[PDB]
């Protein structure tokens, strides 16, 4: 019926490529927003920078919940479109929007009365805390807008419409890029201006999504209350992927906070700065993997809805092969142009001291990017078949047990310093990727048996 549905129901390799690319583009613009924003805020001085840092974990928590619900929505929709179960996909989509309201507004009313004492309960004091509270208040006010935007994106990706999913990301992040200097500097609102810029850009994104869903009504799925039937099976289907997805993203954040502590132990404050920089650069080259993982979930889901294991395996292994080849080019570039990249991320007189260490990190750490596709696409298809708990276990094994465990081991038992941290992270990721790939094969051979 729609071009996206025909993509999903067609050749898996074409769908994989045509769904992943617009997702990579969308995530690249989001990445550009964050980098630009970091530049604006850094020129406001330490108080504003500390206010943002204070609020960082709460913000990541909100994103984890919003994105989690979006992934469970996308997977459930994709599977029912595969089964030619149209009324099921309609009902999943409606259940997801009601869930967006419940989750989004719950976040707002739970965190609004808690935020003043919460940020005071930390060690910090003075202006930075006051700014952090005001900053958080603005974003918590749009918690529903955030969740709704992620659920809408999931509905689009769920029905093979990555182009509009991309567009909404581009619109939101692009608008935030325009509003940032206007709100912070031109209107003189300072750091809280960035919060308002974001809130406004999220609201506008909401309008486009709502317009498509409720006015144009040109999606494959139909969203009406008349054909909404309260279903505990649908709720459980969405949450079996969504909730473990949120926990995975939190396992990621928890690992970063642990690795911060490992980095300060190995190289001091400046070593934390090296880790933070090298990690941002590394997470740049992981963007195509995320885009290809989002596509895998949709195509493996639809293939699983068709009860077509051959199509599922083809999509899965092809995503790995392509992600692998991209990462090779990505890793080669980073290791080759390490000094040039390190220049751009040490763009100040004060960050000049950590440049040499950043180069070494860039000639060691990014190597794991080439093994990541084996574990990530495996996690992606676990979500496609609805088994989120398997994806959670695999991600906990990679981020917490293997990444942090091996980094901690090198710092405790050796004198390698920061180099041991990178090597520990690479070894940790290598192991998990192999374990993940083999678990994936087991699960697939079982699928053929059933």
């Amino acid at each position: 019926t729609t071009k996206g549905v025909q993509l999903l129901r067609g050749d898996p390799k074409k769908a994989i490529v045509r769904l992943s690319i617009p997702m990579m583009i969308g995530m690249s613009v989001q990445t550009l927003y964050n980098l630009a924003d970091g530049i604006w805020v850094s020129g406001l001085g330490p108080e504003s920078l500390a206010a943002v840092g204070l609020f960082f974990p709460v913000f990541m928590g909100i994103i984890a919940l919003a994105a989690g619900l979006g992934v469970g929505t996308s997977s459930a929709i994709a599977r029912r479109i595969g089964a030619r179960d149209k009324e099921g996909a309609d009902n999943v989509a409606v259940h997801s929007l009601i869930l967006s309201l419940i989750l989004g507004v719950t976040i707002t009313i739970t965190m609004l009365p808690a935020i003043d004492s919460l940020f005071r309960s930390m060690g910090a004091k003075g202006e930075a805390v006051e700014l952090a509270i005001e900053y958080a208040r603005v974003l918590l006010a749009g918690a529903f807008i955030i969740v709704f935007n992620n659920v809408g994106n999931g509905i689009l990706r769920g029905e093979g419409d990555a182009n509009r999913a991309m567009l909404a990301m581009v619109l939101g992040s692009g608008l935030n890029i325009v509003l940032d200097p206007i709100f912070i500097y031109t209107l003189g609102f300072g750091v809280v201006g960035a919060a308002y810029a974001t809130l406004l850009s999220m609201v506008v994104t909401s309008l486009f999504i709502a317009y498509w869903l409720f006015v144009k009504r040109d999606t494959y799925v139909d969203i009406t209350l008349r054909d909404f039937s309260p279903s505990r099976e649908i709720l459980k289907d969405i949450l079996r992927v969504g909730l473990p997805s949120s926990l995975s993203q939190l396992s990621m954040s928890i690992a970063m906070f642990f690795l911060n502590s490992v980095a300060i132990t190995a190289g001091g404050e400046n070593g934390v700065a090296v880790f933070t920089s090298a990690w941002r650069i590394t997470m740049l080259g992981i963007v195509p993997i995320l885009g290809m993982a989002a596509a895998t979930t949709s195509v493996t889901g639809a293939a699983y809805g068709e009860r077509n294991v051959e199509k599922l395996e083809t999509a899965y292994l092809y995503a790995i092969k392509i992600a692998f080849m991209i990462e090779l080019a990505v890793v080669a570039f980073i290791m080759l142009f390490a000094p040039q990249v390190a220049y751009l991320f040490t763009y100040s007189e004060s960050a000049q001291v950590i440049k040499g260490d950043l180069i070494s990190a860039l000639r060691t750490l990014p190597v794991f990017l080439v093994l990541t596709p084996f574990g990530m696409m495996t996690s992606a298809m676990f979500q496609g078949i609805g088994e989120g708990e398997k994806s959670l276990i695999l991600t906990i094994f990679r981020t917490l047990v293997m990444q942090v465990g091996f980094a901690y081991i090198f710092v405790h038992y050796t004198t390698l310093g920061l180099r041991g941290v990178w090597i520990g992270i690479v070894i940790g990721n290598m192991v998990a990727a192999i374990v993940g790939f083999l678990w994936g094969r087991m699960r697939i051979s079982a699928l053929k048996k059933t």
């Binding site: 330490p46 920078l49 500390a50 943002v52 840092g53 204070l54 960082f56 974990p57 930390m122 060690g123 910090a124 930075a128 928890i254 906070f257 642990f258 911060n260 502590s261 300060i264 404050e269 934390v272 700065a273 933070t276």
Partner: peptide, 19 residues
């Protein structure tokens, strides 16, 4: 243990185990 501490001068959070 577990502690979760913020460095206002580094703008980053730290997670430590008992120790």
């Amino acid at each position: 243990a577990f502690t979760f501490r913020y460095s206002p001068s580094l703008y980053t959070w730290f997670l430590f185990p008992c120790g």
